[PDB]
Amino acid sequence: PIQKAFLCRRFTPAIEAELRQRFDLEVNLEDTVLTPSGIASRAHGAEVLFVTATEAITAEVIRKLQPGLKTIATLSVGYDHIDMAAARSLGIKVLHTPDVLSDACAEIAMLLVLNACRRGYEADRMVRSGSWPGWGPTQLLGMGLTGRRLGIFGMGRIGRAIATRARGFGLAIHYHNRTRLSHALEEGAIYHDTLDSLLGASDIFLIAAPGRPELKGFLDHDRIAKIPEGAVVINISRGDLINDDALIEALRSKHLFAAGLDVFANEPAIDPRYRSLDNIFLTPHIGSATHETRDAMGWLLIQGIEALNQSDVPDNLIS
Amino acid sequence: PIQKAFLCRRFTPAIEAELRQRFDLEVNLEDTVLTPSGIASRAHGAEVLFVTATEAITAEVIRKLQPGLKTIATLSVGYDHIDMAAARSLGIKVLHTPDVLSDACAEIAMLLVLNACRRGYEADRMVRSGSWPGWGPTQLLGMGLTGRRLGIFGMGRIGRAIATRARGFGLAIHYHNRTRLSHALEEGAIYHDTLDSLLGASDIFLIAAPGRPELKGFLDHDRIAKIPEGAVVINISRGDLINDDALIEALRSKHLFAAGLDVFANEPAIDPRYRSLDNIFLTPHIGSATHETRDAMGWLLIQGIEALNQSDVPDNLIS
Amino acid sequence: IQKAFLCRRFTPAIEAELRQRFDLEVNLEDTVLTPSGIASRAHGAEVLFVTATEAITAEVIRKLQPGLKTIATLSVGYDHIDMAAARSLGIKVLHTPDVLSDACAEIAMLLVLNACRRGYEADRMVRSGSWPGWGPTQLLGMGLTGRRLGIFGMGRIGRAIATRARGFGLAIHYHNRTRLSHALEEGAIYHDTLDSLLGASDIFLIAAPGRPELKGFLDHDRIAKIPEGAVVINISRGDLINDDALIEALRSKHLFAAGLDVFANEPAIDPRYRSLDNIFLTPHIGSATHETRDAMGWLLIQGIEALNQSDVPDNLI
Amino acid sequence: PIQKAFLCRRFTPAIEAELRQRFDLEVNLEDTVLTPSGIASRAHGAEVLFVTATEAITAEVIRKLQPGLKTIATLSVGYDHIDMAAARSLGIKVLHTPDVLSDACAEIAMLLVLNACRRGYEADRMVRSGSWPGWGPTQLLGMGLTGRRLGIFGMGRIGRAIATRARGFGLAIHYHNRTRLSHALEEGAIYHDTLDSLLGASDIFLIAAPGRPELKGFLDHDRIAKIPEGAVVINISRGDLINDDALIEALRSKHLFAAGLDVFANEPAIDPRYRSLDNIFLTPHIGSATHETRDAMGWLLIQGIEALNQSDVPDNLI
C-alpha cells in the first residue's frame, strides 16, 4: 500500500518526481525552514517524513506525529537534528546518507584552501573590475602549498578525503582527533595529542570535526593566537564552532593571512563583517552540492525505505 | 667591482633586499610599465638591467643603453620581449628564469578546475551580496571530479605537476603531446596520438601547452564541438590559444558547463563579455604568483649574474 | 518548457535564443502595447519580456495570474514595473545592469565631437548641395586639445567616457557626491561641489544617473557658472536640464554648442531644439549597439536559467 | 617702403588684421578660387603671395608675377600646387605650414568613425524629423568600436594621432605603409606588408595617406571587395583616392555598413549620389578647421617671412 509522506525541503527535481510516484506526497512548496511546531502541524498523518539538517525533529515533533509517523528519512550524513532517544523509544526507523558525500565535501575544502592561499576572491574581482593593470611580479602574491602543514581538526571520513587530495599539493598532513587513527587510515599523518599542539603546527588550520555541543565557539581569541602568524583557517563542518569576533579580528590584524568558510554561525544571517574582507573566500554551504552526490543522497533514502517496506534491514538505518 | 643595476618592475621585498646588497640599485618605484623610450632614459648608466615580460627591450633600447649595459636579466621563462639579435650584436649577456614555476602554476590550474566545476564565482558572489537564502538541497549544484577525465594539452613539467594534484581528486589523466612521454613520466596517463582524440575524451580540457604561432586560436568552434557536452575548459598557458567568440558561445549553449582562465587574448584588455558570465572563474595571470616561486625566479637571476661576474657560464644564459 | 511573451522586438540574434529556450509568442508589429493589451496578449505566459516602454502595473501582474512567475526587463531601471505588486505575489523581477558603458561612452564622445566640431552644420551643408568648397575660415570649431572636460556623476559610464576623452588631450575634471579612490581617478581633478565643477568645465557633461533631487538642476544660474564659450553634453536623463535655460544660452552664445541624447518629455522634445544650428541631437541611442543590446539580453537569459535551476542570479531585483 | 602682398583666400580675422599691419595688403575679398590667369591679374606687383592648396601656382603664374614676386607662402602642409622648379630657377622663397594640423584632423577622423559606426546622420535626422517614436530596443543599432580593428592606410603623423585617439575606444590598430615604422612609432600597431593583407583585416578602413598621383583611385571595386562584409570606410586625406562608383555601390549593396567622408573627388562638385545615402556622414573638408590650428598655420607664414626679412633661415622654408 502507498504510504503518505511529507517533504520538508525541495529536493532535486529527479528525486521529487520519484517521491511523487512512490508515496502519497505532500510538499513544503515554498522551501521554507519549518519550525518544529510547523512540521508537526503540516506533516500530521504522514507515515514517512523527508527532512534535512535544517529541520529540528524534536521529541515533541515525533510524539505529535503519532500514530502515523513510522520513518524519518534525512538527506544528510548527520542526524543530531533528530531526537534519536525519542525516535528509538517509539521504534521510529531513521535513515540517513552515509558514505556518498565525502568526495564532494573534500572538493569544497580544497577549493577554499586554494582560494584562501592564492587569493581567489581578489583575483576574480580584479579581472572583472575592468581595472586589472596586467601582469606584475608582485601582483596578488599568495602562499604556495608545497612544504606547508595542513592541520586537520577532526580528521574523520571527510577529513581523510581532504588529506588525500591535499598530499598531492605537497602539504604535510597533521591532525587531532580524540583517538589516534590506525596506520591504514593515518597514511602518515602527524597525530597531535591535543588541539593546542595541532594549532601550533598548522600553516593551514582546517575544521572537519562533525561538531558537538562541547565544540561550540571553540576557535576563539586564545586559540587563534596559538596558530602561527600568517596562517589560513578553513571551516567546512559547522559555523558555530568558530567565534566570529575572534576570526574577523585576526583576519583584519593579519595574524591570519586569509580564510575560507563554507559554513557560518547563524547562517544565512552571517556576520555582516565577513562580506567586506578581501582575505576571505565564502561559499554558501555547498559542500555536498554536486549533481551526482545530491542524486545519490536521494536514492539512499528511497532505497532504505524500499528495504523497510520488505522487512529487510537498510544499510543506512541509524539505530 | 660594484655594478650599477636598474629594476624596471618591483620584485618581492626579499629579492629587492638581495639586489641592494649586491648592486648600486635604482628602482622604478611606482611599478609602472615603462615604454622603450622610458627604459632608455631611466636606466641610462646601468650595467645590469632587470626586466620582465612587460618590458619591450628593443634594439633601440639596447643601443641607447650603451656603453654601460652589459647584462639583461629577465624575470620570465620566455625572452620574446628582448631583441636577441640586437643583444648578441652588442655582446650583451641575457639571463632568464626557467623550470621553477610548476608547483605554483599547478595550484592555479587546480584552483580554476575546482571553481569552474563547483561554481566558486556564483558561490562567493551570493554570500557576499547578502542574497543567500540559506542551505538547500538544490542550491548551486556543481560537477564532481570523481569518475571524470582530465585531458591535458601539452603535458610538460607544469602539466605533470597538474596531473599529480589532479589524481588525488579521482580524475583520470589523459594527455596529448607531439611525442609520447616515457613510462616514468607518464605515470599511467592515457596518451592521445592527436589533439582531436584528446578533445573527445576530455570532461575537463586543460591547456598547459606553451604558446606558438601555429597554435594561436586553435581552440575554435570546431574543436570545442569535439569536446563532450557538459565539459569544462581551463587555460593557464596563453590567452591567444583560445578563440574567445567560440568559448563564450559554447559557455552559453551549455555545450560547456563552465571555464577557468588565468590568461586572456589581449590581456589586460580581455574580452568584455567574460566578466558577465556566471559559469566562469577568472584570475589575472597569477599562475606563478607565490612568494616562493617569485623568489626562486629572482634567485636564478642573482646566481646567473654572480656566475657571469666570475666569468662562469650560467645554465640560464640565452644563446 | 516555459511559456514566454515578448512585448517588443529584440535583435534577431536574441530572439533566436529566446525561441530556442521558450514557447515564445512575440509582439510582431512591435507596437507599444497598453497595460490592457499586455494583460490580454500575454495571457498564459510564465515569463514576460519587457522594456522600459511597457507599463507593468499591479493589474497587469494580477490579470496574468496564476501563470506569470517572472518579469524580465531589457533595461537598467525598473520604475515601469510595480515592485510592491510583484513582491506580494512572489514574482521574480530581472533587469540588465552594468553592461552599457562602452556603447554609452561612444555616444558621449560622438556628441562631444559633433558639438565642438560642428557636425550638424557640416553634414547639412554638404548634403544640401550648397558647399562652396574648402576655405581657411569655413566651419571653424573648437579643438579638444588642452581643454577641460567636466563630468558630473563619474561612475562606470563616466569613467569609460574619461578613458576615451584622454586620448584627445582633454584634461579630466569631475564631481561625484563621494570622491573616487586615487586609482580610479587616474589623475582626474576632483571638485567637492557641482558649482566648482561647472566653473572649470570647457565641456560640461552629465553622466550622473540622476535622482529626483537633481531634476531641472541645469538652470539659468548654473549654466551662467560655466565659462563663456563652453559645450554642454547630456546622455543621462532629459529632465536634468531646464530647456528654456539651455536654449537661451545657446542663442546668446554663452554656450558655443550642445549635444543631447536625452530630452525632457521625450519623444515630445522642446520643438525649438530642431531649429538650432549649434546643437547635435541623437534619439536616446546611448546603448544602441548590437553587442550591448545582445549583452543585456544575455543577462536576462542567464538570470532565467539560474531561476529555473532554483538558483539566485545577481540581477534579481 | 614695406612689402606688397596679395592674399588669395580669406584667412581668419586675427591673421588678416596682422597681415594688414605688416604689409601693403590686397585681398581676394570674395574668397573665390582664383584661376592661374585670375591670380596673375590680381597679384601683379605683389612681392609676397599668400596662397592655399586651392591656388594653382604654375610656372606661368610665377613668370607673369616677375620681377616683384620673390616669396610664396602657402597655408598648407603640401606644396604640390606650386611649381617648385620654376620657383627655384627664379630664386623665389617658398614657405609652408608643417606639423600643426594632426590633432584637429584626428578629431574629424574620429567624428567620422563615430558617426558612421553609430549612425549619426540618421540619428540627428530622426530627432529633427518630428516623428521620432521614442526609445526602442532595436532603434538605430550600430557597431560598437570595442574589440574592432581600425586599419590605417598610410599611418603618418595624422594616422598616428588618429591611432592615439582610437586606442581609447578599444580599437586594435592595424596599418600598411610602403615602409614599416619603427617600434617606437608603432606603439603596438599591427603591420601588414601588403595593402591586400590590411584590407582583409579592417573592420574600419581608414585612409590617412597623404595624396600622391600613384594612389589616385586606389580604393576600387576589387579592393573594397577585400574589406570584410559590414565594415566602415573613412577618408580624411584626399578625395580622388577613392573610386566613387565602387564606394557608392558597396554602400548601397551593404557590403559596407557605412562611410565617413571629409574629402571627395572633384570637391566641391562631389558625386551627387552621396547626398541620398543614409549610411554616410559627410563633412566639408574641415579636417584642420579649428581656430587654434588655422591661426597657428597663419602665424607660421608670418613668422617665416619675418625671419626672411631678418636674413635668417626659417624652419618652414622649402
Ligand SMILES: [Cl-]
Ligand atoms: Cl554600464
Ligand SMILES: [Cl-]
Ligand atoms: Cl580651437
